[PDB]
Amino acid sequence: SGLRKMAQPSGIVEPCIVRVAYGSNVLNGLWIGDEVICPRHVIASDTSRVINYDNELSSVRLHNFSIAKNNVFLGVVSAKYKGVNLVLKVNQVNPNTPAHKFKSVKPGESFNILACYEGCPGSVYGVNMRSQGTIKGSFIAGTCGSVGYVLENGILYFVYMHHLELGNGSHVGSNLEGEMYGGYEDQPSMQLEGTNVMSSDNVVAFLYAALINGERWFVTNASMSLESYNAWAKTNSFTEIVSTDAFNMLAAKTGYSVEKLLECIVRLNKGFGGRTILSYGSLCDEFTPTEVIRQMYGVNLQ
Amino acid sequence: SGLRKMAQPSGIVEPCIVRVAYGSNVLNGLWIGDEVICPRHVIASDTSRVINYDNELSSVRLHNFSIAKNNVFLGVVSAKYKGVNLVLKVNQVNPNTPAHKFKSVKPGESFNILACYEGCPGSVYGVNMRSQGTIKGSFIAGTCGSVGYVLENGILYFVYMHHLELGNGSHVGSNLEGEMYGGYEDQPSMQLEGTNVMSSDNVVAFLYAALINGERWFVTNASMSLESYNAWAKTNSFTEIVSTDAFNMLAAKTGYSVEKLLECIVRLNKGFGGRTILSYGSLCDEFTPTEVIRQMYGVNLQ
Numbered sequence: 001s002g003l004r005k006m007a008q009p010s011g012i013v014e015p016c017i018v019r020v021a022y023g024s025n026v027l028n029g030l031w032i033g034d035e036v037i038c039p040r041h042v043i044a045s046d047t048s049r050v051i052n053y054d055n056e057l058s059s060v061r062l063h064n065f066s067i068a069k070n071n072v073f074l075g076v077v078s079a080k081y082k083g084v085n086l087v088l089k090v091n092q093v094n095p096n097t098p099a100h101k102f103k104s105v106k107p108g109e110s111f112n113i114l115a116c117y118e119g120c121p122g123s124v125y126g127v128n129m130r131s132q133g134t135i136k137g138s139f140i141a142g143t144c145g146s147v148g149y150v151l152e153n154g155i156l157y158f159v160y161m162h163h164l165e166l167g168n169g170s171h172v173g174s175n176l177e178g179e180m181y182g183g184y185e186d187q188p189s190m191q192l193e194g195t196n197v198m199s200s201d202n203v204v205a206f207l208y209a210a211l212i213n214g215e216r217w218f219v220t221n222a223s224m225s226l227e228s229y230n231a232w233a234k235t236n237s238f239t240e241i242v243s244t245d246a247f248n249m250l251a252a253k254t255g256y257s258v259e260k261l262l263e264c265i266v267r268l269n270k271g272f273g274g275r276t277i278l279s280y281g282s283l284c285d286e287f288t289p290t291e292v293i294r295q296m297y298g299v300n301l302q
Numbered sequence: 303s304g305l306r307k308m309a310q311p312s313g314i315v316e317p318c319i320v321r322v323a324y325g326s327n328v329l330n331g332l333w334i335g336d337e338v339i340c341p342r343h344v345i346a347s348d349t350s351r352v353i354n355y356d357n358e359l360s361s362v363r364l365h366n367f368s369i370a371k372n373n374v375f376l377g378v379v380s381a382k383y384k385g386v387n388l389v390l391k392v393n394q395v396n397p398n399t400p401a402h403k404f405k406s407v408k409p410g411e412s413f414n415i416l417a418c419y420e421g422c423p424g425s426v427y428g429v430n431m432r433s434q435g436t437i438k439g440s441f442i443a444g445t446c447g448s449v450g451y452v453l454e455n456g457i458l459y460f461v462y463m464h465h466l467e468l469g470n471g472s473h474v475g476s477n478l479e480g481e482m483y484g485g486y487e488d489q490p491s492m493q494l495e496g497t498n499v500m501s502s503d504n505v506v507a508f509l510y511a512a513l514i515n516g517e518r519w520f521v522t523n524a525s526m527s528l529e530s531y532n533a534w535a536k537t538n539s540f541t542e543i544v545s546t547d548a549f550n551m552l553a554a555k556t557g558y559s560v561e562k563l564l565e566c567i568v569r570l571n572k573g574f575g576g577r578t579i580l581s582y583g584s585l586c587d588e589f590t591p592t593e594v595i596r597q598m599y600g601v602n603l604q
């Protein structure tokens with residue numbers, strides 16, 4: 001029993017983290033093959049005013065880079081922008097490059113953050129991509145370049161590189177192609193996050209987890225069609241459910257239909273009445289159906 | 303900005319996990335050197351009735367063990383009890399044995415759980431040892447033998463191996479010397495957990511983190527001495543603060559004294575009144591002062 005936000009093991013990613021320093025800036029880079037990827041703003045001369053990245057790459061001095069992993073320093077051969085990321089060809093192939101692919105995470109999907117501090121892997125935790133392309137993590141100075149990843153059907157996927165934090169505390173990053181999530185820009189300009197839309201798929205899985213544990217106070221006999229629930233969701237800042245097929249095992253083992261839980265959401269969306277579901281005071285959308293299944297009946301851990 | 307329960311990177315521990323099966327029981331073992339450690343109840347024939355471990359070790363058939371790591375199967379040479387743990391001498395040294403030590407965590411101290419499912423490392427997350435020697439994690443069938451660890455001053459410490467779950471959902475394990483935390487017995491008896499005592503040191507760190515992030519609704523002009531709070535905490539299931547010299551840094555740069563936060567605890571212990579601190583609905587004692595400092599000003603990462 002028990003539900004906890006988790007991260008997939010990080011051992012495969014740790015050997016790819018390097019310290020990247022340029023001028024007075026220090027952050028992290030991803031060393032895979034003969035290439036080091038890091039946020040391009042590390043070569044910006046002043047991150048307090050608008051940045052002319054064209055005029056930063058053209059004045060860059062390759063010898064002024066300092067890339068290191070445990071007293072092993074790499075020389076930069078060439079530098080180019082891949083989106084908002086610098087792609088640095090280095091003079092040494094990473095001997096510990098794992099088999100890997102690249103992909104982007106979508107709203108509601110969970111992935112792992114390897115929080116790195118000035119080149120030192122420090123912690124690992126699970127996160128969830130929000131509707132506006134942001135995550136609510138724990139990033140501070142020197143953690144840019146921290147990598148996000150997911151393991152699926154035994155394949156490492158690099159899906160996130162940290163770039164900045166918005167004024168409201170939300171954390172913005174990019175994919176490994178340099179496309180910033182949510183369309184945000186790596187500039188010190190005032191940028192706003194829209195209304196957050198809660199993942200209905202994850203809230204259903206969250207309620208399934210409570211039932212599996214033994215918490216049943218919020219359930220009744222009432223049900224609601226995915227069509228009636230989707231109509232409400234479009235006006236209550238909730239996503240629309242595309243299928244119940246992802247909840248087949250949960251429904252089979254609990255004996256509760258997705259529609260019965262769709263009704264619990266609209267009813268519980270008005271207030272838990274001082275009550276609690278798995279120690280949470282309101283609806284939680286941080287656990288995906290896969291995350292719940294992995295913890296309750298350790299199946300398909302990747 | 304941001305506070306999230308995190309785990310230290312697990313790459314150093316992952317290569318020590320093996321699948322241990324005996325008869326119909328399947329769980330995890332820690333393969334370090336020429337020895338594999340796992341909960342001794344893996345040789346129990348019936349885990350629904352009292353177990354005579356003396357008569358189980360005497361009837362044990364070493365060849366009935368199945369220990370494997372990928373395509374590497376290990377042969378058991380000898381077996382002995384170290385407390386509640388089975389110590390199995392094997393015919394092969396783990397080539398990836400890391401430098402390590404063993405120690406026990408104390409109440410209020412945090413550590414990392416590498417959740418393994420029948421020999422497959424599946425996830426990693428942080429936990430906090432409670433006063434009664436239990437943790438509130440997420441363990442299910444087949445996760446016994448999952449190991450807890452901490453990285454301190456560049457030293458890997460093995461500090462936990464999971465054994466069982468109590469009727470109230472609390473999770474029980476032992477250190478690697480075989481001493482069950484909290485004094486529980488590795489028997490299917492209906493054992494009881496006493497009143498949980500909140501770690502005052504960790505709740506203070508939690509409030510410091512909230513202030514650093516930007517929350518202040520809970521702040522008043524009042525403060526409370528450490529003698530007055532300690533007297534209040536002997537009767538409200540909170541630990542006694544022995545010294546404020548663990549928060550000098552947090553108090554110095556937040557501009558709030560421990561005494562102010564001690565008053566916030568006594569008042570907030572009666573309910574947040576619908577409000578939330580860092581998204582929590584009640585006082586949280588799961589973050590140690592060190593954990594907070596690590597996330598707010600990345601220092602002492604190990």
Ligand SMILES: *C(=N)[C@H](C[C@@H]1CCNC1=O)NC(=O)[C@@H]1C[C@@H](C(F)(F)F)CN1C(=O)[C@@H](NC(=O)OC)C(C)(C)C
Binds near residue numbers: 140143144164189
């Ligand atoms: C990378 N190490 C930091 C991470 C940042 C520090 C505090 N909280 C965090 O997560 N990233 C940055 O410093 C970027 C780099 C600059 C720019 F994005 F290229 F312009 C500015 N950065 C910011 O994060 C700023 N945020 C912002 O620009 O909002 C538009 C702040 C938060 C002011 C550092």
Ligand SMILES: *C(=N)[C@H](C[C@@H]1CCNC1=O)NC(=O)[C@@H]1C[C@@H](C(F)(F)F)CN1C(=O)[C@@H](NC(=O)OC)C(C)(C)C
Binds near residue numbers: 329442446492
């Ligand atoms: C190991 N894989 C499991 C983990 C267990 C499964 C469900 N929740 C968990 O954490 N551990 C066990 O099955 C032990 C082994 C037996 C014994 F401890 F040796 F007696 C029984 N176990 C239990 O966990 C039981 N709990 C218990 O004994 O209370 C003291 C339950 C969960 C009732 C099987």
